[PDB]
Amino acid sequence: GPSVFLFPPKPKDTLMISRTPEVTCVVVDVSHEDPEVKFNWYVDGVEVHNAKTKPREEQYNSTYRVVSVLTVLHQDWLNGKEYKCKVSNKALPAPIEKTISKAKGQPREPQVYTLPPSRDELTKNQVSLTCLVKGFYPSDIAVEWESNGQPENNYKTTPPVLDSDGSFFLYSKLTVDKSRWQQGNVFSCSVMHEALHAHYTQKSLSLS
Amino acid sequence: GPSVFLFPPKPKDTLMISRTPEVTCVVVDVSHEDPEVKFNWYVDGVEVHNAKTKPREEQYNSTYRVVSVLTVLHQDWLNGKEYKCKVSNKALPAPIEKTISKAKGQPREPQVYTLPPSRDELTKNQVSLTCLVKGFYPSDIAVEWESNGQPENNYKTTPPVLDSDGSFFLYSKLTVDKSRWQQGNVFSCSVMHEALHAHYTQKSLSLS
Numbered sequence: 001g002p003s004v005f006l007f008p009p010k011p012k013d014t015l016m017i018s019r020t021p022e023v024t025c026v027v028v029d030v031s032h033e034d035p036e037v038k039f040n041w042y043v044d045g046v047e048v049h050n051a052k053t054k055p056r057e058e059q060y061n062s063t064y065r066v067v068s069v070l071t072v073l074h075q076d077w078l079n080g081k082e083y084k085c086k087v088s089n090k091a092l093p094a095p096i097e098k099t100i101s102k103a104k105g106q107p108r109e110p111q112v113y114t115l116p117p118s119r120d121e122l123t124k125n126q127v128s129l130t131c132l133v134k135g136f137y138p139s140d141i142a143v144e145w146e147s148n149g150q151p152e153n154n155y156k157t158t159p160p161v162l163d164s165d166g167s168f169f170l171y172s173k174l175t176v177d178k179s180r181w182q183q184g185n186v187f188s189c190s191v192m193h194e195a196l197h198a199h200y201t202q203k204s205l206s207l208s
Numbered sequence: 209g210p211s212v213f214l215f216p217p218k219p220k221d222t223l224m225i226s227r228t229p230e231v232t233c234v235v236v237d238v239s240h241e242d243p244e245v246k247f248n249w250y251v252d253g254v255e256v257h258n259a260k261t262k263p264r265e266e267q268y269n270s271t272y273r274v275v276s277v278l279t280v281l282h283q284d285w286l287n288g289k290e291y292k293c294k295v296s297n298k299a300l301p302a303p304i305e306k307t308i309s310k311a312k313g314q315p316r317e318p319q320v321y322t323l324p325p326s327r328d329e330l331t332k333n334q335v336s337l338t339c340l341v342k343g344f345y346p347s348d349i350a351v352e353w354e355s356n357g358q359p360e361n362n363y364k365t366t367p368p369v370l371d372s373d374g375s376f377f378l379y380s381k382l383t384v385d386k387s388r389w390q391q392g393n394v395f396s397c398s399v400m401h402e403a404l405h406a407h408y409t410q411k412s413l414s415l416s
């Protein structure tokens with residue numbers, strides 16, 4: 001019947017002390033027949049009571065969806081604590097358990113390189129600015145572009161890819177009008193990751 | 209009872225005339241009580257009988273696994289014809305129908321750009337050669353590297369990523385010994401895609 005999906009905090013939230021990371025427990029296919037759901041949360045086995053469950057709400061299919069959110073401490077998530085969400089419902093003979101933690105494995109520092117557009121690309125009115133981020137472990141990561149403190153609209157980032165040494169890599173393509181590039185504007189790829197010092201680094205790229 | 213799996217040809221196979229693309233119809237779980245299986249092939253609903261089907265091989269889970277291979281015409285697959293493999297078994301109330309055809313959508317031509325390693329990366333013994341392939345549709349594509357006409361296989365390629373204008377892009381990373389890069393060896397990124405002229409193009413990258 002009702003299924004449960006447990007989601008981790010956003011990388012950004014866990015890596016910036018100013019932000020609040022939370023684990024999210026989503027119960028779907030809750031039926032009108034038995035629409036009561038109780039959540040029990042556990043951090044490394046020990047129960048906790050600061051979860052806020054949202055009021056259940058109807059779906060376009062006539063099931064109910066119901067979500068419980070548990071704020072987590074940056075250090076706890078980064079230190080590898082296990083978060084367990086226990087879901088009990090009258091239609092469930094025995095509760096459903098999902099437990100989640102950060103990716104296991106030795107953390108590896110990302111190397112961040114910026115690559116300008118190929119010469120060939122200057123025959124267009126738009127050009128490709130490239131951020132190559134490689135050698136990192138946990139795949140969990142945030143990569144963003146900006147120019148003079150302002151975030152850039154047109155960019156897309158590949159999913160992380162398992163490289164041969166077992167680290168991950170990825171690329172982010174930033175698209176700007178050629179004039180912006182030829183004007184000598186400075187663009188910046190920002191990267192946030194746990195094995196980075198102060199969880200953050202940025203590399204610049206402009207026309208020299 | 210018996211299950212049927214229909215497999216598309218490899219992009220690279222459909223794309224190079226000197227290669228042989230084929231659609232593969234795998235039937236698993238055929239009982240020893242109802243072993244006789246017959247294949248009927250239909251291109252755009254028109255039956256064909258040039259399928260080489262291998263004699264049934266016995267597994268370890270008591271069932272057999274028969275394979276039928278249809279060598280398809282390059283042009284055919286690429287013109288979007290529909291390959292219907294119809295397997296008959298006596299343990300079936302009705303003969304299963306599995307059909308397949310190449311992805312639909314307006315074909316778009318990939319732009320291919322080679323990008324040398326950031327200067328920052330020359331502090332390493334290994335460097336990263338980057339191929340940017342963008343603006344293609346069908347996300348079906350083959351990307352490969354070589355040097356001196358010989359394949360260079362220490363590379364990893366990202367999945368196609370849906371870009372903001374509806375087409376796909378990707379990146380291929382080729383890792384070589386810095387010493388090879390600085391002796392000025394020429395590496396080449398070969399792309400194969402249906403929307404390319406002659407279904408092939410290549411860009412080279414060497415020390416500048």
Ligand SMILES: *[C@@H]1O[C@H](CO[C@@H]2O[C@@H](C)[C@@H](O)[C@@H](O)[C@@H]2O)[C@@H](O[C@@H]2O[C@H](CO)[C@@H](O[C@@H]3O[C@H](CO[C@H]4O[C@H](CO)[C@@H](O)[C@H](O)[C@@H]4O[C@@H]4O[C@H](CO)[C@@H](O)[C@H](O)[C@H]4NC(C)=O)[C@@H](O)[C@H](O[C@H]4O[C@H](CO)[C@@H](O)[C@H](O)[C@@H]4O[C@@H]4O[C@H](CO)[C@@H](O)[C@H](O)[C@H]4NC(C)=O)[C@@H]3O)[C@H](O)[C@H]2NC(C)=O)[C@H](O)[C@H]1NC(C)=O
Nearest residue numbers: 003004005007008010024026028029059060061062063065
């Ligand atoms: C009635 O409707 C509801 C609402 O659904 C909505 O219906 C209409 C309107 C359509 O628009 C739907 O697309 C729309 O969602 C239905 O509820 C849905 O139920 C399905 C399953 O039936 C769920 O699918 C799961 O999706 C998760 C990931 O979901 C995230 O991303 C989705 C899109 O990518 C997004 O839609 C979700 O909102 C969710 O988004 C995340 O949410 C959190 C919290 O807000 C947020 O922090 C994130 O930022 C956000 N992220 C993203 C990407 O947006 C997917 O992971 C599930 O896959 C698991 O299960 C599969 C088998 O069941 C299996 O193939 C996968 O491998 C995986 O299995 C797990 O695997 C791991 C390891 O691999 C293992 O450890 C686990 O044990 C294992 N779990 C198993 C096997 O159970 C899965 O595909 C939808 O999320 C859900 N939609 C919503 C919005 O709630 C409902 O089904 C409908 N009722 C009926 C009967 O049809």
Ligand SMILES: *[C@@H]1O[C@H](CO[C@@H]2O[C@@H](C)[C@@H](O)[C@@H](O)[C@@H]2O)[C@@H](O[C@@H]2O[C@H](CO)[C@@H](O[C@@H]3O[C@H](CO[C@H]4O[C@H](CO)[C@@H](O)[C@H](O)[C@@H]4O[C@@H]4O[C@H](CO)[C@@H](O)[C@H](O)[C@H]4NC(C)=O)[C@@H](O)[C@H](O[C@H]4O[C@H](CO)[C@@H](O)[C@H](O)[C@@H]4O[C@@H]4O[C@H](CO)[C@@H](O)[C@H](O)[C@H]4NC(C)=O)[C@@H]3O)[C@H](O)[C@H]2NC(C)=O)[C@H](O)[C@H]1NC(C)=O
Nearest residue numbers: 211212213215216232233234236237267268269270271273
């Ligand atoms: C008895 O044994 C046989 C085989 O023996 C085997 O060997 C023993 C010793 C064990 O080690 C076992 O490995 C195994 O028992 C069993 O037969 C198997 O049956 C399973 C299903 O139970 C099949 O799984 C399917 O796999 C396909 C993809 O298959 C390719 O990749 C596999 C790895 O993923 C690989 O193992 C296969 O060999 C195969 O390899 C490809 O072969 C082609 C042929 O030329 C070649 O071109 C390719 O290059 C090559 N690829 C490689 C090597 O990379 C997978 O696609 C199927 O997934 C679909 O179906 C699933 C349900 O089964 C479903 O969960 C998925 O979502 C997916 O569903 C699809 O959904 C979409 C959307 O609707 C739709 O487009 C699809 O049509 C739909 N498919 C549906 C609905 O059918 C699937 O998982 C195995 O291939 C098969 N093994 C072999 C080798 O034939 C048998 O089950 C055993 N009987 C028992 C248990 O009693």
